[PDB]
Design a protein around this ligand. Sequence first.
Ligand SMILES: [Mg+2]
Ligand SMILES: [Mg+2]
Ligand SMILES: [Mg+2]
Ligand SMILES: [Mg+2]
Ligand SMILES: [Mg+2]
Ligand SMILES: [Mg+2]
Lengths: 367, 367, 354, 354
Amino acid sequence: MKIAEIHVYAHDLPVKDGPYTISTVWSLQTTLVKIVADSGLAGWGETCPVGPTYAPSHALGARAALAEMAPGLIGANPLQPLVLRRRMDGLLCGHNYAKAAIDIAAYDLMGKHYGVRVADLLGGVAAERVPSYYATGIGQPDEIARIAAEKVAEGFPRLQIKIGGRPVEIDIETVRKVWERIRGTGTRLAVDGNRSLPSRDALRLSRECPEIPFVLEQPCNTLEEIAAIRGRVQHGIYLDESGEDLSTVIRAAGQGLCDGFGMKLTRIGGLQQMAAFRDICEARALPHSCDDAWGGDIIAAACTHIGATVQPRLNEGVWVAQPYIAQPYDEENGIRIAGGHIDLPKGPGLGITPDESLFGPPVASFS
Amino acid sequence: MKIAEIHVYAHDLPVKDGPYTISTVWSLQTTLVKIVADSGLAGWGETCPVGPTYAPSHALGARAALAEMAPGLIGANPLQPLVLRRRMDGLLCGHNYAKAAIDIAAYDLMGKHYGVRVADLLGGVAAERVPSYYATGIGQPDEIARIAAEKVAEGFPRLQIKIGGRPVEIDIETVRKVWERIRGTGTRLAVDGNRSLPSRDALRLSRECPEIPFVLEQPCNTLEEIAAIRGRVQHGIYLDESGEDLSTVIRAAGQGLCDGFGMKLTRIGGLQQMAAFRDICEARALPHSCDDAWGGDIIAAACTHIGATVQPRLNEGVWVAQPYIAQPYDEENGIRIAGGHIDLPKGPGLGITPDESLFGPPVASFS
Amino acid sequence: MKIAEIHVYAHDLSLQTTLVKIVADSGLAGWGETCPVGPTYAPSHALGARAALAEMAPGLIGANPLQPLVLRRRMDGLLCGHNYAKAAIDIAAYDLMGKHYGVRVADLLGGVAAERVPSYYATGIGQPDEIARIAAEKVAEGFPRLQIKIGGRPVEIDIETVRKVWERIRGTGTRLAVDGNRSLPSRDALRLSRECPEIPFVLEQPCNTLEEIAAIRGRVQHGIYLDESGEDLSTVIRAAGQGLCDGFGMKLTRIGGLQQMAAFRDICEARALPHSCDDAWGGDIIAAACTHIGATVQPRLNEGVWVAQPYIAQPYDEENGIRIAGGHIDLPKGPGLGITPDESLFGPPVASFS
Amino acid sequence: MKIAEIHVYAHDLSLQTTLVKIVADSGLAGWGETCPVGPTYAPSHALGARAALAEMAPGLIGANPLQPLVLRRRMDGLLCGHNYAKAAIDIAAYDLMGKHYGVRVADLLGGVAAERVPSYYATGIGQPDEIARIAAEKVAEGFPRLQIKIGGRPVEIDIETVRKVWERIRGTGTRLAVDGNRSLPSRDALRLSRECPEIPFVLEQPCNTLEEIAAIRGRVQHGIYLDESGEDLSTVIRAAGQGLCDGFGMKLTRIGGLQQMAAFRDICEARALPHSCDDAWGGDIIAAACTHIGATVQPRLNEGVWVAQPYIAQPYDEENGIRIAGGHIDLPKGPGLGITPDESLFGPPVASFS
Ligand SMILES: [Mg+2]
Ligand SMILES: [Mg+2]
Ligand SMILES: [Mg+2]
Ligand SMILES: [Mg+2]
Ligand SMILES: [Mg+2]
Ligand SMILES: [Mg+2]
């Protein structure tokens, strides 16, 4: 097989009952990639930054990066994801979030070609139904507590409470009121500082609440700050935004700098790298989620496929933007949350067939 | 431009309702510097140690250091603060507190020359009104608690409780009674040991009060002692007196030895170095104050100008001695606390025009 | 698809190799192999291999052989450790997968990065002049890398050997490794490197434990590679994350199979740590497995694939077995491992499970 | 004063450079530039530059261009990362500031410490004898420092190049840097330093990651400089505070502009860490910006300002553009950057915002 065509698409996704406050976002522009083989067989990828301020990545940026690489990828074998990743690195440094769109499209194409689900190309389906988790927005303490209780009732096995960007007393009150509503339900709790807490405040949050079993997710902006407070914090600490590449994961795992990860597939550079990430975590019993920043059926299915291969006791869940998205790409097999969990699609490849019409004509085509 | 004249002045400032107990001080002698350019344009600086025992600096010392350097500064370009600092280092080693008086006078002169506020020469005004904080003296627990409540009512967003020099049980009682009066007002709390606590007592203070959200400011005498207890202390620790120069700040930030700073402008050597200090803290999300030991309108305006450039979420405030000083240098635009905050002066340079007569004739003049 | 039968074979090469044949419901078969290089090199041996396989086999009947990670966890649920035995099952399943999808194993592990894989030649211990001659002969045959085995005798002799080998190969563009095979006290590893700064070897597993290696690393100016100490992925992660070594000699059977070997490769690539893809010993089946993972390694980080072929008289597959040619190995063309063993050579299974 | 217009230009040099023109309400204009040295040197590229600028520009209209730190925070509020693009806006604002106050940019960054700024010459990869000749020719032209690029081939050749260059320049008082451009495995970086103690190079960014550099630093007796690893001020603070390097090659666009470059300079000066003030590539505008910050560096710590000028046929400003003369660069005399680009050379903007 050989890549004959690459098509790049721009597409809008508005948030139902927005805004979503982390980066505050009111609507999203996702970028889709279609790879077409010699045989006419096609595979789909997707990348969608959650606003331009959450990570060093944006929509205009994804398309420029993809247009930079695409002519150099015509003629490449799409059935060789590691060889393909190296070829990409030879065309553009960094830009993992754009390279991930190509990597996903290639696995989709591989699965369709061999007649196999992407999860089975990544080591095999460990669970047909994968846990998810609900991430609350920043808001009033009592209202976040009400939402938390409602989501536990829906069947979510884990909740992530977003905090920061305001006095930490309010964050602390939110955490306590949420715990009061969900204690004794067996629901797991994460508190996500989204890089916004000075060490002063991360120390206070943990010191004041030893009896509340949260993990502190990316509380500070840099890995250096996190490494400095770790010894003084008795709650587990997870890395998210700091987990920028496999090399950094190796540093954090090998030097014992964290107790887990919230990992985004686009950030690490795609499924080839994500599988290696998964294996490092499993060797060290580090729980992790398999998420992305945002996006529709394509990126959501990719996250679900890698999530289905994770050892169940280490699976902190797969987050998807589906509940905030009005129009799915695939009304028949698209990714849906049901009872706080996600059923893996049953068909070959990602198991998703995008209604290509929805996206409009490509903003760029390459052959 | 060139420096034509440098004039050094000695001037007394008595503390209203003194003494102020940290070093116990009953009145203060400040030192002022006037730099006069070829064009006759003038700029003002000030340095005022808070008694001779708080830091390795004193009033007689400032004037001897200034007289040592001044003949070597005639003819220098006052519009080049880094070049000027290097020229000073070539005349006298150390003595940052005296070099700072010259540095401030040079920025004042620059601002007047270009028609720009000093804060806009330091990166720009981030806030026209800067927060301040109130520092209580050492005293009886109930009385310090009463004062704390009164200052919160005045609008101070942060309080610093001075402790030490007596059994730590009394310091601990003070902290608890203050917290009882201000809890739930959103007021931030610092406890300043002013180098006086053995590690034994700093450990006890933090261990006994996990539920009281203070930061522990310079609890022990040396940075070495602080580095040794850090891992065992669950409250944030700020450096003050230990932050002697930019090199030490780089050590503390880069090795993760503290969670913030109380920084004095004269100690670091002036505004050129203070701006670099600010940038290091901002890169690491380390909150800090912009203070000095003491002094009137000149040094207070200099602290306020650098304070106005600090990222608001990292600004622990600007401390000034104004409420303890009877006669301001500038009755029209001089620095005043109002509602626990300080309005930045609106005019060019420091925005301060000292009533030169107040100071008396210079004790030393150079041309 | 499901595993319907597992057959275990014993075969002499001598060294006692152990072959595994996995048969699916369809009758489609995959082959694996494991062959400890004597019972004293590693915590592994031939009788142990067959015992471990006998322990796991009944609990693997009915398993899906197309899911290498799920299969590895299932094995872990039947027997702790024993990676050298688990590796035989893992290899057979990849062979079967490849045949099922009609794809080379290397293209199931990320893709072929090179059809011609470099090898390296490992000299046994011997007299300095004789080792130096063999070094020169092997360079002439095309091997791009030589590994000189030392230890078990006064280090003066090891140092003499290294200097004479270097005399012969300097300027040929040949890379040099000196393998202490866990046998040097720190005392001697320090002396070896201290006396020879102008000789560009890497020091491979000079000392017995990772602890001893971490203790001398700062005092040694030659790159240090881990071999025997790289017992599992967790230890690789420690060594890479804490900067305890500059490369690896990695054995497929030691790490537990191709699934784990692929993750090990990705860790090394992220940190620019060169490595070889070897095993202790064995014929076409284990040799093919090493060649396949070797073909996926970034060429600039590939220290080579070692195989026992030159020491083995009878290949399992006369047409397409692994052969060294010009110091390199060509990747087989066929699906799976690309190897088809003549089962008549092995005799009937010593154990069958169904 | 407020930003009223931002105009983005594309121009070939080939390398694709991107120019930015900021126009204030008064009509007063400032110029910036960013030009990645190919899309593979750094996580940056020309199409990416224009995309990032297009993302930020609308949100910058109305901003006060006389407040470089407030402006930087405002940019951060519009787009995370992308320092190489932010740098173009930062430079244009300093140019505008300088013109507004009638002051050279260097005197807005602390003051001119030298009117004549040292440069250094960077040899591309090539054959050892040819590189050695170019080294000698460039020393004769007056360059006080030479940087030799290596890697991407067997290290024996890099070592031969270094030795031949040294043969030619020893005794001329020329300083030497050897740049590995992220391409050496620890194995080879160790060998390079181990074999050449008598050659006084610093080893610049030998390995890909800061992690690998921290791991070999104690075993390497030559000074080590960071380049590509110095991605932001936070990483500089780590490297300086933990003693992970002995100096820096710093690129203005990588660190995000002159505001951050000034703080970086102050950190290096406090720790006596020598550094260069460079960028990837580009014409008079980026070259002038580097020269201005370079003119503020303590002379004893100034490793030089590199510019692409010798490789560029058409300067933007025929009268006062940046030129290398005698291995040094004279600081322009005029206000702002002291440069006045002939806009007719660039063609109309590819994007305009108002
Ligand atoms: Mg997160
Ligand atoms: Mg203090
Ligand atoms: Mg050869
Ligand atoms: Mg070995
Ligand atoms: Mg010279
Ligand atoms: Mg460089």
